[PDB]
Amino acid sequence: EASCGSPPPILNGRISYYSTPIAVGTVIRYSCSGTFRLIGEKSLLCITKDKVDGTWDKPAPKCEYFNKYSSCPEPIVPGGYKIRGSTPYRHGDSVTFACKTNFSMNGNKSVWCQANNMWGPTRLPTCVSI
Numbered sequence: 001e002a003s004c005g006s007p008p009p010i011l012n013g014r015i016s017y018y019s020t021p022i023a024v025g026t027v028i029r030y031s032c033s034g035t036f037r038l039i040g041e042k043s044l045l046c047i048t049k050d051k052v053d054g055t056w057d058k059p060a061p062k063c064e065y066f067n068k069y070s071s072c073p074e075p076i077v078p079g080g081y082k083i084r085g086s087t088p089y090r091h092g093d094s095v096t097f098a099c100k101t102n103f104s105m106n107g108n109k110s111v112w113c114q115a116n117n118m119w120g121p122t123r124l125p126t127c128v129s130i
């Protein structure tokens with residue numbers, strides 16, 4: 001059966017338990033110590049596109065040293081709406097979006113407020129009328 005290689009490591013962070021070989025369907029969780037903030041989706045899933053090679057479904061998140069002064073402006077996604085997240089958006093805070101009725105999403109539904117005062121680590125999702 002297809003399997004995944006070692007999960008992407010994380011500076012100043014930890015990964016939850018995983019057995020080897022890593023079977024397709026395996027999920028691992030990332031976390032950071034108290035003085036750091038996890039940026040990006042915390043859970044990775046081992047998938048396979050061709051049933052021969054296994055690959056993780058997304059890049060690993062990262063741990064950023066807490067910057068207490070950082071804040072992000074209200075993120076806006078045309079055709080979509082915020083379903084989770086409250087202002088003010090400080091370092092490590094996240095917002096989740098859903099597309100309006102008759103719109104379909106492309107991209108990650110959640111973004112995080114980074115130390116550089118920008119939303120990331122990915123672009124905000126796009127909601128397209130279908």
Ligand SMILES: *[C@@H]1O[C@H](CO)[C@@H](O)[C@H](O)[C@H]1NC(C)=O
Pocket residue numbers: 040041057058059106107108109121122
């Ligand atoms: C972002 O979302 C896309 C589309 O769902 C996915 O393919 C990609 O792996 C995600 N990346 C991260 C860092 O979450």
Ligand SMILES: *[C@@H]1O[C@H](CO)[C@@H](O)[C@H](O)[C@H]1NC(C)=O
Pocket residue numbers: 101102103130
């Ligand atoms: C949204 O409405 C349009 C027009 O009726 C239609 O083409 C599309 O399939 C609808 N989307 C969903 C998810 O029902």
